[PDB]
Design a protein around this ligand. Structure first.
Ligand SMILES: Nc1nc2c(ncn2[C@@H]2O[C@H](COP(=O)(O)OP(=O)(O)OP(=O)(O)O)[C@@H](O)[C@H]2O)c(=O)[nH]1
Ligand SMILES: [Mg+2]
Ligand SMILES: [Mg+2]
Ligand SMILES: [Mg+2]
Ligand SMILES: [Mg+2]
Ligand SMILES: [Mg+2]
Ligand SMILES: [Mg+2]
Ligand SMILES: [Mg+2]
Ligand SMILES: [Mg+2]
Ligand SMILES: [Mg+2]
Ligand SMILES: [Mg+2]
Ligand SMILES: [Mg+2]
Ligand SMILES: [Mg+2]
Ligand SMILES: [Mg+2]
Ligand SMILES: [Mg+2]
Ligand SMILES: [Mg+2]
Ligand SMILES: [Mg+2]
Ligand SMILES: [Mg+2]
Ligand SMILES: [Mg+2]
Ligand SMILES: [Mg+2]
Ligand SMILES: [Mg+2]
Ligand SMILES: [Mg+2]
Ligand SMILES: [Mg+2]
Ligand SMILES: [Mg+2]
Ligand SMILES: [Mg+2]
Ligand SMILES: [Mg+2]
Ligand SMILES: [Mg+2]
Ligand SMILES: [Mg+2]
Ligand SMILES: [Mg+2]
Ligand SMILES: [Mg+2]
Ligand SMILES: [Mg+2]
Ligand SMILES: [Mg+2]
Ligand SMILES: [Mg+2]
Ligand SMILES: [Mg+2]
Ligand SMILES: [Mg+2]
Lengths: 190, 16, 49, 45, 243, 91, 95, 166, 117, 97, 26
RNA sequence: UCUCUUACUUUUAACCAGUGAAAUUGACCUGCCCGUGAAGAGGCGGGCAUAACACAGCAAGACGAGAAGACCCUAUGGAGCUUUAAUUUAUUAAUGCAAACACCUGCAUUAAAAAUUUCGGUUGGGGCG
RNA sequence: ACUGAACUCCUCACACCCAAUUGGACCAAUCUAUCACCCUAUAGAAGAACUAAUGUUAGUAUAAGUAACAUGAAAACAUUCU
RNA sequence: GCUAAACCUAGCCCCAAACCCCACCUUACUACCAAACCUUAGCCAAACCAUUUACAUAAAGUAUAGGCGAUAGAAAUUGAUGGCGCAAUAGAUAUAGUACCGCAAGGGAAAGAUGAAAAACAAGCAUAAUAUAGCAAGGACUAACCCCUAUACCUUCUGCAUAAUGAAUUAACUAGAAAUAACUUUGCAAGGAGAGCCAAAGCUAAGACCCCCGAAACCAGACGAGCUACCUAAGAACAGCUAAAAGAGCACACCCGUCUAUGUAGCAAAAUAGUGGGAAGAUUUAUAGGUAGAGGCGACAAACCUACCGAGCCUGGUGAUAGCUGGUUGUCCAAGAUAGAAUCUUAGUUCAACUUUAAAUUUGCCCACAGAACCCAAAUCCCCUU
């Protein structure tokens, strides 16, 4: 939701074209009283309560809550036997058929989320293999998220990724109140 | 007095 | 929304209005309770505890 | 008795609502500008 | 949709595009730069900070100029930055009374001024403030040459400034002919205001006048292609003969 | 028209099916059918009391008929059966 | 009051309330008694003493003032020598 | 719009077994967009319902209503197509099983009234439908006699049951 | 009341109908008494050539070979008309080669054009 | 008769197109990247409501403040009218006070 | 046209039911 | 005109043929008497009456149809007008004082002319509150 | 004596009769996420539900086949007559 | 089985990025003759109205302003790859600023749907009019009716079948937008929060909460004197008779419109027939021009100014405002009805009272004695037990 920006909009009776004059006098005509041909009651009139402008749904959960959610996702995958730890993502070949057959043989789910430490060091073989696959998605460690972890049936982590995630998520536990945004220099925070 | 109101003509000069 | 009246019409008076009687928050005399509040110095307490 | 308030005469028509008269004053120039902005086929009468 | 640029930058963009782009740099800078005119109809605050008595705190204070309306007649005269104040007043100077539209107009006098640089006497509708400024500047020529565009606030004044500056830049012998000593004395007296003639030409010109000047400067009847092709063919034949 | 109702046909039919046996436009026009259908259901609900009330009245009338055929009156028959401890009901 | 200011979209404070009432952080509102400066020559000493006192406000009056003032006025203020520092908190209060 | 009446002539039945009664022929004909009120056409349709083709033609030939000529033309066309295409042996061996008038597509016009007010004239058009069935016209439903009607009464009396009991 | 129909000389009163024309170019002027004086020089004179012996025809045989369109340019015309003389005289005052400093003095001035078609 | 007489054309949704597959990635860019980038910076949309939320009146005020100078003439007139009307509604109408 | 599928499916089912009732299969 | 109305002609009218509106309309399977009732009922209670439909007249009822009728009252609703209603003199016309050496400008005073806004509440029909 | 309620009993079952207002449990349809794959599920959203505004638009009724409208005559359809 | 029903794409919405031959100012679209710049106002809020009233983040709704009241409101300082959009009553008004309407400004529509190839089930009616009696149904019944029961709905009301309002009917469209403080659910916890802010268990995040139509009006800027009021220029008409030189008489044309009848959605948004006044004059009238709305013009009738002038019309402010009227759309259950005070206030609102929800702990009601006034009845209050 927080990224969502609904672009739906409707023209109110004020923004509808025309509708300035009174359609007919108050009395004597025998018709219903009206003040403009663009009021919501009229055909072609404005919308009384419609979507108004591009609306944002942005809201931020506490970073502790978000880290806790990441931890809970990891625990859920481990407990449900969908989490697999790898030494490295290096493949014998970059052929997607090899990766699909490997997953099927190891009884991984129809969808696999492979994670590597950094975008730059990701092996070329696995990069090529996953570039041509729809249900096998390869992401850097920083890109791990609850939504993708849930969408993909199985989650594959390398040992460096495990260490990195452990460090980052545990750091949220046993940290002070933020005196100022953590992007700013701190005594012990890289 | 209230003036009479004329409807648009197309409504009556429609044709097959 | 009730039945008729300003409350149903959505046009009941402003907050603090008492139907024309001199409002409570205006019939009390002004006193310097908060005069210069933005210039009074504030010091966070730090107990020896 | 009423209804026939329009007694057509091209001289009056052009001298009252013509292009020359509309351009004669700044207000009429704005009338023509409004018609052009709206896209009226007939800018002046 | 949204315009790429704010509407208030459209004038600057139009300056940066077209003949305005070809206009000389110094004139463009003079137009772009804007300095607040000297206060005339209001007393400026002494300093940037003040101790307001209500709470005894140091508060920033800004000088907000009173909007002045300058009728076209002013452009034909020299009003010392003075003009019409179109504002409102409270009857009997109490805010609980009625509010009334009020126009304050300067007292205009017809006076004759002699310009030493131009060696001409001008009859000008003038204000007492303008007379005081002239007295302070020690002459009409000094007043014109010292007062900037904003403080002068007069098309006629700026035209006089341009005339004097062009006279100084050219050292025109037309200033008191057959009196070179007197001409040199006047030029020496007003020496400090001398500027290059290429710049003095554009002093005080409105944007439209500068555009017209540039268009007249750069308008040239197109050269017939006969001459161009003849020159090209002669050059090519010369190259072939050499080679 | 982000959200429009698409079931209005079935919403109308749910009521009209109950009015299909009415007279006049009440069986076709929903504006009229709904009012009569509501009245029909209210009458159906309130009629469960009148059914019981009329059944006892019918039974009492028939019992009176028979007791008069035997020369007795319904009050006498009922009271004396009660006193004999014959707890037969009117039905 | 203004539930949404036109320039910031924030809720505004009725400064007439600030000019008249003191809010203790506990939630109590203090006020002066109306007429404590009026025609004292015709008021008995007991009446004058009653009028010269600082008085708390009703629950509904306190709610009204809280609505009419924003959260800035409902903060902890550690002034130097506030005479109401002790009164800013309640003690031994049961329900 | 609907044009099922025209299609109704295109239904082909399977061949009949020799030991089966001869299926009477049926011809559906119609004329669309007749400049005539369907209400006025209905009277002529009802008039000729259930009559033989010849009797209907005779009745319509001497009727002053405008729709009479149109209905006569439609009936003549129906007879012609019945003989030519629907294998009807005798022209006169046909009777009008069904004849109805349907509303056509109409046009709206303005009728000017006295004080700048107006009404909406409708240039009314109507359709006309006929089904011609081969064979003599069915006999008119004879009026129920006292004997049969008292028979019905006695049957109703006998149908009585002891209501609201065992 | 008709705003859309084109305004012609058939619409206004007698004065309007007389005054407005149909685009026909004027031939002369009007003197006192509404007498029209027609100037002979104002009448376009059709310079019709003698077509006798002309071999060209309104159409061209389809047997003619196809060619590539090469619109004439100022450079091409200069090369084909002036360049030979310029070269022959240079190997051995531009009015000699054809250039005229000013169109004034010519019956057919190129700019502003003062001839029909 | 407000009911369609034919089934609408089948709607096939590819749940594994790149957008859906990679949706949400880098939502934890902050906590997993030393907080160099705030997650709201991943928001792509109107400049005046990137990483910000509010009711219609606040949204209109922010739009006028941030891109008011760049708005078209009639759009800006409509925005000013909408701001005026929303002010009146939210400050003078409603059930509560 | 109204976006949606459930109302259309229900109406198709009702049409099928009515068609079967009018012309039940042998 | 009437006592006192009659005769005839045309139009209208009614029937046949063509064309073909409008106000109106909650649904109507649309009765009478008495009583009842948001106080004058086709619809309720007790009686009476009672096959079904067309066509032409009538205007007693449907508190009949037509303009959120006429009249009266209310609204912290308008608007026009008059004023010794309140607030002003922004504007003009006069003067006075400044400024300049009559005109112009600034400030005052007096008028004319206008401008904005309001016209509390509870009681009282033959008053003078 | 009997008749006589939705009172009470009896067999079974029970949240299943107050205006304004207030609390709560569910839910039609739409889109989005993920399921499902002869119509759906868990959630997130919102232009999210019409027997009523002399409501707006469109269709067709009622009044009503009514009010109202129209073509001088004969004829060889040349023509003549009133 | 007719009228009809449906459909999917024409396009549109919000963002991002990016800055976009000839003729024609005279009567426009006609070939060719001696001069701009100048405060917005008002509605509206203040419950009237008169001063006044809004047009990145944080500081902060703070300092300040203010019939010190409605409300208004800084600065120092901080640093900043598309659609949980519409899909022909929707989305632009748009197939189009066209048709059409108005003198003009200006207002302003509607609708189309086959195929790969065309070189192939609403209403309303009809089938099929109708049977004593009755809000049209329910209980039923062998049986449609017959029998018994049953005073349409909505809204406004103390109370409506009410002979109080709205509704012919079908389809579509059509009306609850949000802070403060609370409550629930998480996270973390003397700290919470992704700077600012809060904190004496707080803090962060989410969930949840506030309608639609309608005035007469006011102000700004345009457009209107082809009608009409008056005027300017230059024209025209006035038979016949009588009297003679006429604001004369009778009476045509012409102008007007006294009375009667018809008509009253009409022939007509002011007419027809008869009758009647003037009809050589202050007459009638064709043409062009002029006076324009806090204005014009007026033989003052508050007359006329393009059919509706005690102040025109159009557009805009404007979704004006309305304590007033009307409307306010799924199912089901539950609690649920009036002590008063103040008010330019009695058609309204604030408080109280009543009512609802959640929470805390502890007495609540009924009530035995005893007890509650002298002046000059019923009962009530208080009240252990129960
Ligand atoms: N958000 C948004 N993105 C747009 C819009 N128009 C185009 N784009 C994006 O522009 C990007 C490039 O469009 P392409 O057509 O692929 O390339 P292009 O023509 O070079 O693009 P432009 O330079 O934007 O014209 C795509 O990612 C589009 O989604 C728009 O209106 N909004
Ligand atoms: Mg508008
Ligand atoms: Mg629209
Ligand atoms: Mg209501
Ligand atoms: Mg005329
Ligand atoms: Mg007419
Ligand atoms: Mg007839
Ligand atoms: Mg009675
Ligand atoms: Mg009759
Ligand atoms: Mg009745
Ligand atoms: Mg009324
Ligand atoms: Mg019993
Ligand atoms: Mg019970
Ligand atoms: Mg809705
Ligand atoms: Mg509906
Ligand atoms: Mg309706
Ligand atoms: Mg009919
Ligand atoms: Mg009739
Ligand atoms: Mg008739
Ligand atoms: Mg007000
Ligand atoms: Mg459309
Ligand atoms: Mg049907
Ligand atoms: Mg009624
Ligand atoms: Mg009423
Ligand atoms: Mg009605
Ligand atoms: Mg005139
Ligand atoms: Mg005469
Ligand atoms: Mg005379
Ligand atoms: Mg006159
Ligand atoms: Mg008078
Ligand atoms: Mg009068
Ligand atoms: Mg008028
Ligand atoms: Mg309103
Ligand atoms: Mg209950
Ligand atoms: Mg008062």
């Amino acid at each position: 939701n927080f990224k969502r920006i609904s672009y739906a909009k409707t023209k109110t009776r004020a923004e509808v074209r025309g509708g300035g004059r009174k359609p007919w006098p108050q009395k004597g005509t025998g018709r219903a009283r009206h003040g403009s041909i663009r009021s919501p009651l009229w055909r072609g009139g404005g919308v009384a309560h419609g979507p108004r402008g591009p609306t944002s749904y942005y809201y931020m959960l506490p970073m502790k809550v978000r880290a806790l959610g990441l931890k809970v996702a990891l625990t859920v995958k481990l407990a449900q036997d969908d989490l697999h730890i790898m030494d490295s993502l290096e493949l014998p070949t970059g052929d997607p058929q090899y990766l699909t057959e490997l997953a099927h043989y190891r009884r991984w789910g129809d969808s696999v989320l492979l994670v590597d430490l950094t975008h730059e060091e990701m092996p070329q073989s696995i990069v090529e293999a996953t570039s041509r696959l729809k249900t096998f998605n390869l992401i850097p460690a920083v890109g791990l998220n609850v939504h993708s972890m849930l969408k993909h049936q199985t989650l594959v982590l390398t040992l460096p990724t495990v260490a990195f995630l452990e460090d980052k998520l545990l750091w949220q536990d046993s940290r002070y109140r933020p005196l100022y945004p953590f992007s700013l220099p701190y005594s012990d925070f890289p | 007095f209230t003036p009479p109101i004329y409807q648009p003509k197309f409504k009556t000069e429609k044709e097959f | 929304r009730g039945h008729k009246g300003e409350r149903q019409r959505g046009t009941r008076p402003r907050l603090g209005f008492e139907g024309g009687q001199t409002p409570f928050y205006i019939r009390i005399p002004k006193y310097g309770f908060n005069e210069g509040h933005s210039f009074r110095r504030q010091y966070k307490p730090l107990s020896l505890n | 008795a009423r209804g026939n308030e329009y007694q057509p005469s091209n001289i009056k028509r052009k001298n009252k609502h013509g292009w020359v008269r509309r351009l004669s004053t700044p207000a009429g120039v704005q009338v023509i500008l409004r018609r052009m902005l709206k896209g009226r086929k007939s800018l002046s009468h | 949709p949204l315009h790429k640029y704010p509407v208030w930058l459209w004038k600057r963009l139009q300056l940066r595009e077209g003949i305005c782009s070809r206009l000389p740099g110094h004139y463009l800078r003079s137009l772009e730069e804007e300095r607040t005119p000297t206060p005339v109809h209001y007393r400026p605050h002494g300093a940037k900070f003040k101790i307001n008595p209500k709470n005894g705190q140091r508060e920033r204070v800004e000088d907000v100029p009173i909007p002045i309306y300058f009728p076209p007649e002013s452009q034909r005269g020299l009003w010392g930055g003075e003009g019409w104040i179109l504002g409102q007043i409270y009857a009997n100077n109490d805010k609980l009374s009625k509010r009334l539209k009020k126009v304050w107009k300067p007292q205009l006098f017809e006076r004759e001024f002699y310009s030493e640089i131009l060696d001409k006497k001008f009859t000008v509708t003038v204000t007492m403030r303008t007379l005081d400024l002239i007295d302070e500047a020690y002459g009409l020529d000094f007043y014109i040459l010292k007062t900037p565009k904003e403080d002068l606030c007069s098309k006629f004044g700026m035209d006089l400034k341009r005339g004097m500056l062009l006279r100084l830049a050219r050292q025109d012998p037309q200033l008191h002919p057959e009196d070179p000593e007197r001409r040199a004395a006047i030029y020496d007296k007003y020496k400090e205001f001398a500027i290059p003639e290429e710049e003095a030409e554009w002093v005080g010109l409105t944007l439209e006048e500068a555009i017209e000047k540039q268009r007249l400067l750069e308008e040239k009847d197109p050269v017939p292609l006969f001459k161009i092709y003849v020159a090209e063919l002669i050059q090519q034949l010369q190259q072939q003969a050499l080679s | 028209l982000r959200n429009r109702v698409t079931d209005r046909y079935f919403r109308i039919q749910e009521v009209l099916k109950h009015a299909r046996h009415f007279r006049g436009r009440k069986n076709r026009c929903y504006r009229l059918a709904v009012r009569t259908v509501i009245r029909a259901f209210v009458k159906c609900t309130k009629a469960r009391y009148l059914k019981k009330k009329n059944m006892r009245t019918l039974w009492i009338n028939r019992i009176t008929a028979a007791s008069q055929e035997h020369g007795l009156k319904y009050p006498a028959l009922i009271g004396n059966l009660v006193k004999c401890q014959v707890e037969l009901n009117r039905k | 009051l203004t539930y949404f200011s036109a320039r910031k979209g924030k809720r505004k404070t009725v400064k007439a309330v600030i000019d008249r009432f003191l809010r203790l952080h506990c939630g109590l509102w203090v006020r002066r008694k109306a007429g404590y400066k009026k025609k004292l020559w015709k008021k008995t000493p007991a009446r004058k003493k009653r009028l010269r006192e600082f008085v708390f406000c009703n629950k509904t009056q306190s709610k009204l003032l809280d609505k009419m003032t924003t959260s800035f006025w409902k903060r902890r203020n550690w002034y130097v020598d506030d005479p109401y520092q002790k009164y800013h908190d309640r003690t031994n209060l049961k329900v | 719009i609907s044009r099922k009446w025209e299609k109704k002539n295109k239904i082909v039945y399977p061949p009949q077994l020799p030991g089966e009664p001869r299926r009477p022929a049926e011809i559906y004909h119609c004329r669309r967009q007749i400049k005539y009120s369907k209400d006025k056409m209905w009277y002529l349709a009802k008039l000729i319902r259930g009559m033989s083709i010849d009797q209907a033609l005779a009745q319509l030939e001497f009727n002053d209503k405008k729709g009479a000529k149109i209905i006569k033309e439609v009936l003549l066309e129906a007879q012609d197509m019945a003989v030519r295409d629907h294998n009807v042996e005798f022209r006169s061996n046909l009777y009008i099983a069904e004849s109805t008038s349907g509303r056509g597509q109409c046009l709206k016009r303005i009728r000017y009234h006295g004080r700048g007010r107006f009404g909406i004239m409708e240039k009314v058009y109507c359709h006309y439908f006929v089904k011609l069935v081969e064979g003599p016209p069915p006999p008119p439903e004879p009026p129920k006699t006292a004997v049969a009607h008292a028979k019905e009464y006695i049957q109703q009396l006998r149908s009585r049951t002891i209501v609201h009991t065992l | 009341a008709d705003r859309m129909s084109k305004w012609t000389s058939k619409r206004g009163p007698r004065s309007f109908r007389g005054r407005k024309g149909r685009g026909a170019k004027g031939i002369g002027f009007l003197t006192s008494g509404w007498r029209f004086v027609q100037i002979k020089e104002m009448v376009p004179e059709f310079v019709v050539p003698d077509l006798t012996g002309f071999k060209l025809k309104p159409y061209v045989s389809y047997l003619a070979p196809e060619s590539e369109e090469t619109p004439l340019t100022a450079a091409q015309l200069f090369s084909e008309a002036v360049a030979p003389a310029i070269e022959k005289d240079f190997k051995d005052n531009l009015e000699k080669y054809g250039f005229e400093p000013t169109q004034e003095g010519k019956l057919f001035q190129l700019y502003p054009r003062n001839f029909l078609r | 008769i407000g009911i369609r007489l034919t089934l609408p054309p089948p709607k096939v949704v590819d749940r594994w197109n790149e957008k859906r597959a990679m949706f949400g990635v880098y939502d934890n860019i902050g906590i997993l990247g030393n907080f160099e980038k705030h997650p709201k910076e991943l928001i792509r949309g109107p400049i005046w409501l990137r990483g910000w939320k509010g009711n219609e009146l606040q949204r209109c005020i922010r739009k006028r403040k941030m891109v008011g100078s760049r708005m078209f003439a009639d759009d800006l007139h409509n925005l000013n009218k909408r701001i005026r009307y929303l002010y009146k509604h939210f400050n003078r109408h409603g059930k509560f006070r | 046209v109204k976006k949606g599928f459930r109302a259309a499916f229900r109406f198709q089912k009702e049409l099928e039911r009515q068609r079967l009732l009018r012309c039940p299969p042998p």
